Protein backbone atom coordinates (compact mmCIF):
# COMPACT_ATOMS: atom_id res chain seq x y z
CA UNK A 1 0.00 0.00 0.00
CA UNK A 2 0.81 1.09 -2.43
CA UNK A 3 2.33 -2.00 -4.11
CA UNK A 4 3.98 -2.42 -7.51
CA UNK A 5 2.07 -4.61 -10.00
CA UNK A 6 2.44 -5.94 -13.50
CA UNK A 7 -0.56 -6.97 -15.51
CA UNK A 8 0.14 -8.94 -18.62
CA UNK A 9 -2.03 -10.64 -21.13
CA UNK A 10 -0.55 -13.24 -23.41
CA UNK A 11 -1.40 -15.98 -25.85
CA UNK A 12 0.49 -18.95 -27.11
CA UNK A 13 -0.35 -21.87 -29.26
CA UNK A 14 -0.54 -24.09 -26.18
CA UNK A 15 -3.77 -25.30 -24.70
CA UNK A 16 -4.44 -23.94 -21.32
CA UNK A 17 -4.40 -27.30 -19.65
CA UNK A 18 -0.86 -28.04 -20.75
CA UNK A 19 0.43 -24.61 -19.79
CA UNK A 20 -1.24 -24.58 -16.42
CA UNK A 21 0.40 -27.93 -15.65
CA UNK A 22 3.88 -26.97 -16.88
CA UNK A 23 3.89 -23.35 -15.57
CA UNK A 24 1.86 -23.94 -12.40
CA UNK A 25 1.02 -27.40 -11.11
CA UNK A 26 4.41 -28.99 -11.93
CA UNK A 27 6.49 -25.71 -12.29
CA UNK A 28 8.86 -26.76 -9.57
CA UNK A 29 9.87 -29.71 -11.61
CA UNK A 30 9.62 -28.14 -15.07
CA UNK A 31 12.09 -25.40 -13.98
CA UNK A 32 14.87 -28.01 -13.49
CA UNK A 33 13.97 -29.36 -16.96
CA UNK A 34 14.17 -26.16 -19.02
CA UNK A 35 17.06 -24.65 -17.03
CA UNK A 36 19.24 -27.51 -15.74
CA UNK A 37 22.09 -25.05 -15.70
CA UNK A 38 20.52 -22.86 -12.97
CA UNK A 39 18.37 -25.23 -10.82
CA UNK A 40 19.22 -28.51 -8.94
CA UNK A 41 15.92 -29.76 -7.67
CA UNK A 42 12.32 -28.74 -7.22
CA UNK A 43 10.20 -30.56 -4.67
CA UNK A 44 7.02 -30.37 -2.54
CA UNK A 45 7.79 -30.14 1.16
CA UNK A 46 4.29 -30.50 2.59
CA UNK A 47 0.98 -30.46 0.78
CA UNK A 48 -0.87 -32.12 -2.01
CA UNK A 49 -1.48 -29.89 -4.93
CA UNK A 50 -3.99 -27.87 -3.01
CA UNK A 51 -3.99 -24.74 -0.87
CA UNK A 52 -1.15 -24.92 1.66
CA UNK A 53 1.11 -27.19 -0.41
CA UNK A 54 4.63 -25.75 -0.21
CA UNK A 55 7.29 -26.26 -2.87
CA UNK A 56 11.05 -25.86 -2.76
CA UNK A 57 13.26 -25.03 -5.77
CA UNK A 58 17.01 -25.36 -5.09
CA UNK A 59 19.64 -23.65 -7.18
CA UNK A 60 22.76 -25.28 -8.54
CA UNK A 61 25.85 -24.84 -6.36
CA UNK A 62 27.54 -22.10 -8.45
CA UNK A 63 24.46 -19.86 -8.43
CA UNK A 64 24.26 -16.69 -6.23
CA UNK A 65 20.64 -17.37 -5.14
CA UNK A 66 20.03 -20.24 -2.89
CA UNK A 67 16.55 -21.75 -2.76
CA UNK A 68 12.90 -20.60 -3.01
CA UNK A 69 9.79 -21.87 -1.27
CA UNK A 70 6.28 -21.01 -2.54
CA UNK A 71 2.82 -21.60 -0.99
CA UNK A 72 -0.28 -22.53 -2.94
CA UNK A 73 -3.06 -20.14 -1.61
CA UNK A 74 -5.85 -20.78 -4.11
CA UNK A 75 -6.11 -23.44 -6.81
CA UNK A 76 -9.01 -24.01 -9.04
CA UNK A 77 -7.14 -26.42 -11.37
CA UNK A 78 -10.32 -27.10 -13.45
CA UNK A 79 -10.55 -23.43 -14.44
CA UNK A 80 -6.88 -22.83 -15.03
CA UNK A 81 -6.73 -20.58 -11.93
CA UNK A 82 -3.96 -20.17 -9.34
CA UNK A 83 -2.88 -17.54 -6.77
CA UNK A 84 0.53 -18.48 -5.20
CA UNK A 85 3.13 -16.68 -3.13
CA UNK A 86 6.94 -16.64 -3.02
CA UNK A 87 7.51 -16.32 0.69
CA UNK A 88 11.05 -17.68 1.55
CA UNK A 89 14.58 -18.10 0.11
CA UNK A 90 17.73 -16.15 -0.61
CA UNK A 91 16.05 -14.91 -3.72
CA UNK A 92 13.94 -12.17 -2.13
CA UNK A 93 16.17 -9.07 -2.08
CA UNK A 94 15.78 -6.81 0.89
CA UNK A 95 12.88 -4.38 0.36
CA UNK A 96 10.27 -6.92 -0.84
CA UNK A 97 8.25 -9.05 1.56
CA UNK A 98 6.87 -11.56 -0.90
CA UNK A 99 5.89 -11.93 -4.49
CA UNK A 100 2.23 -12.82 -5.18
CA UNK A 101 1.28 -14.43 -8.47
CA UNK A 102 -2.28 -14.71 -9.85
CA UNK A 103 -2.83 -16.79 -12.90
CA UNK A 104 -5.85 -17.62 -14.92
CA UNK A 105 -5.81 -19.30 -18.28
CA UNK A 106 -8.52 -19.79 -20.81
CA UNK A 107 -8.69 -21.93 -24.06
CA UNK A 108 -8.78 -20.00 -27.34
CA UNK A 109 -9.22 -22.09 -30.43
CA UNK A 110 -6.11 -24.12 -30.87
CA UNK A 111 -4.43 -22.59 -27.79
CA UNK A 112 -4.28 -20.21 -24.83
CA UNK A 113 -5.06 -16.80 -23.33
CA UNK A 114 -3.30 -16.05 -20.03
CA UNK A 115 -3.81 -13.09 -17.84
CA UNK A 116 -1.14 -12.81 -15.18
CA UNK A 117 -0.71 -10.29 -12.45
CA UNK A 118 2.45 -10.09 -10.35
CA UNK A 119 2.21 -7.96 -7.28
CA UNK A 120 5.48 -6.97 -5.54
CA UNK A 121 5.10 -6.54 -1.80
CA UNK A 122 7.52 -4.12 -0.06
CA UNK A 123 8.40 -4.99 3.58
CA UNK A 124 7.15 -2.72 6.46
CA UNK A 125 7.36 0.87 5.19
CA UNK A 126 10.17 0.34 2.62
CA UNK A 127 10.25 0.86 -1.19
CA UNK A 128 10.32 -1.72 -3.98
CA UNK A 129 13.05 -1.60 -6.62
CA UNK A 130 11.88 -1.29 -10.23
CA UNK A 131 14.94 -3.15 -11.53
CA UNK A 132 13.68 -6.23 -9.68
CA UNK A 133 10.33 -5.87 -11.45
CA UNK A 134 12.03 -5.99 -14.84
CA UNK A 135 14.23 -8.94 -13.68
CA UNK A 136 11.21 -10.86 -12.37
CA UNK A 137 9.31 -10.40 -15.64
CA UNK A 138 12.26 -11.42 -17.83
CA UNK A 139 13.13 -14.52 -15.83
CA UNK A 140 9.53 -15.91 -15.75
CA UNK A 141 8.95 -14.91 -19.36
CA UNK A 142 11.95 -16.54 -20.95
CA UNK A 143 11.11 -19.70 -18.95
CA UNK A 144 7.63 -19.64 -20.47
CA UNK A 145 9.24 -19.25 -23.96
CA UNK A 146 11.49 -22.31 -23.33
CA UNK A 147 8.41 -24.32 -22.07
CA UNK A 148 6.13 -23.17 -24.88
CA UNK A 149 8.61 -24.08 -27.50
CA UNK A 150 8.96 -27.37 -25.72
CA UNK A 151 5.31 -28.21 -25.34
CA UNK A 152 5.04 -27.24 -29.03
CA UNK A 153 7.46 -29.74 -30.48
CA UNK A 154 6.13 -32.63 -28.28
CA UNK A 155 2.28 -32.49 -28.35
CA UNK A 156 2.40 -35.64 -26.23
CA UNK A 157 3.52 -33.96 -23.02
CA UNK A 158 0.78 -33.09 -20.53
CA UNK A 159 -1.64 -33.51 -23.43
O1 LIG B 1 12.12 -29.47 -20.01
S1 LIG B 1 10.99 -29.10 -20.78
O2 LIG B 1 11.21 -29.61 -22.13
O3 LIG B 1 10.86 -27.64 -20.82
C1 LIG B 1 9.49 -29.80 -20.14
C2 LIG B 1 8.40 -29.00 -19.93
C3 LIG B 1 7.20 -29.52 -19.41
C4 LIG B 1 7.09 -30.81 -19.15
C5 LIG B 1 8.18 -31.71 -19.35
C6 LIG B 1 8.06 -33.10 -19.07
C7 LIG B 1 9.07 -33.93 -19.35
C8 LIG B 1 10.29 -33.47 -19.85
C9 LIG B 1 10.48 -32.10 -20.11
N1 LIG B 1 11.71 -31.61 -20.59
C10 LIG B 1 12.73 -32.52 -20.95
C11 LIG B 1 13.48 -32.28 -22.09
C12 LIG B 1 14.37 -33.22 -22.60
C13 LIG B 1 14.52 -34.43 -21.93
C14 LIG B 1 13.77 -34.67 -20.80
C15 LIG B 1 12.86 -33.72 -20.34
C16 LIG B 1 9.38 -31.20 -19.90
O1 LIG C 1 3.30 -14.69 -18.54
S1 LIG C 1 4.46 -15.20 -17.78
O2 LIG C 1 5.32 -14.08 -17.41
O3 LIG C 1 5.21 -16.12 -18.61
C1 LIG C 1 3.93 -16.07 -16.34
C2 LIG C 1 4.42 -15.71 -15.12
C3 LIG C 1 4.00 -16.38 -13.97
C4 LIG C 1 3.16 -17.45 -14.05
C5 LIG C 1 2.60 -17.86 -15.28
C6 LIG C 1 1.68 -18.91 -15.36
C7 LIG C 1 1.18 -19.31 -16.57
C8 LIG C 1 1.55 -18.67 -17.76
C9 LIG C 1 2.45 -17.60 -17.73
N1 LIG C 1 2.73 -16.85 -18.89
C10 LIG C 1 1.97 -16.97 -20.05
C11 LIG C 1 2.55 -16.96 -21.29
C12 LIG C 1 1.79 -17.22 -22.42
C13 LIG C 1 0.44 -17.51 -22.30
C14 LIG C 1 -0.15 -17.50 -21.07
C15 LIG C 1 0.63 -17.24 -19.96
C16 LIG C 1 3.01 -17.19 -16.46
O1 LIG D 1 20.14 -12.44 -16.14
S1 LIG D 1 20.47 -11.76 -14.90
O2 LIG D 1 20.65 -12.77 -13.85
O3 LIG D 1 19.40 -10.86 -14.55
C1 LIG D 1 21.98 -10.84 -15.11
C2 LIG D 1 22.05 -9.52 -14.76
C3 LIG D 1 23.24 -8.76 -14.92
C4 LIG D 1 24.38 -9.33 -15.41
C5 LIG D 1 24.36 -10.69 -15.79
C6 LIG D 1 25.51 -11.31 -16.30
C7 LIG D 1 25.49 -12.61 -16.61
C8 LIG D 1 24.36 -13.41 -16.45
C9 LIG D 1 23.19 -12.87 -16.00
N1 LIG D 1 22.06 -13.64 -15.75
C10 LIG D 1 22.18 -15.03 -15.49
C11 LIG D 1 21.38 -15.60 -14.54
C12 LIG D 1 21.47 -16.93 -14.26
C13 LIG D 1 22.41 -17.70 -14.88
C14 LIG D 1 23.23 -17.14 -15.79
C15 LIG D 1 23.12 -15.82 -16.08
C16 LIG D 1 23.16 -11.48 -15.63
O1 LIG E 1 10.96 -15.39 -11.79
S1 LIG E 1 10.73 -16.85 -11.80
O2 LIG E 1 9.59 -17.07 -12.62
O3 LIG E 1 10.50 -17.33 -10.46
C1 LIG E 1 12.14 -17.67 -12.45
C2 LIG E 1 12.01 -18.57 -13.49
C3 LIG E 1 13.13 -19.19 -14.07
C4 LIG E 1 14.36 -18.91 -13.68
C5 LIG E 1 14.60 -18.04 -12.61
C6 LIG E 1 15.91 -17.75 -12.15
C7 LIG E 1 16.09 -16.89 -11.13
C8 LIG E 1 15.01 -16.26 -10.50
C9 LIG E 1 13.72 -16.49 -10.90
N1 LIG E 1 12.68 -15.76 -10.35
C10 LIG E 1 12.74 -14.43 -10.01
C11 LIG E 1 12.09 -13.95 -8.88
C12 LIG E 1 12.16 -12.61 -8.56
C13 LIG E 1 12.89 -11.75 -9.35
C14 LIG E 1 13.51 -12.23 -10.47
C15 LIG E 1 13.44 -13.58 -10.80
C16 LIG E 1 13.47 -17.38 -11.97
Numbering used by the authors: 1 to 159
Cite, word for word, the article reporting this structure.
This characteristic fold, termed the PR-10 fold (or the Bet v 1 fold after birch pollen allergen, which was the first PR-10 protein to have its crystal structure solved) strongly suggests the binding/storage of hydrophobic ligands. Hyp-1 has been postulated to catalyze the oxidative coupling of emodin to hypericin, the main pharmacological ingredient of St John’s wort, although this enzymatic activity has been questioned.
The maps show excellent electron density for either one, two or three internal ANS molecules (at sites designated 1, 2 and 3) per Hyp-1 protein and 29 interstitial ANS molecules. Two ligands are bound in internal chambers (sites 1 and 2) and one in a deep surface pocket (site 3) formed by residues Lys33 and Tyr150. Sites 1, 2 and 3 are occupied in 22, 25 and 13, respectively, of the 28 protein molecules in the asymmetric unit. The Hyp-1 molecules are arranged into dimers through intermolecular β-sheet formation between β1–β1 strands, although the protein is monomeric in solution. Seven of these dimers have the same orientation and nearly equal repetitive spacing along the c axis, while the remaining seven are their copies through a noncrystallographic 21 axis in the c direction. Rigid-body refinement of the 28 copies of the protein molecule in the C2 solution confirmed that this solution does not obey any higher symmetry, though it is pseudo-symmetric with pseudo-tetragonal symmetry.
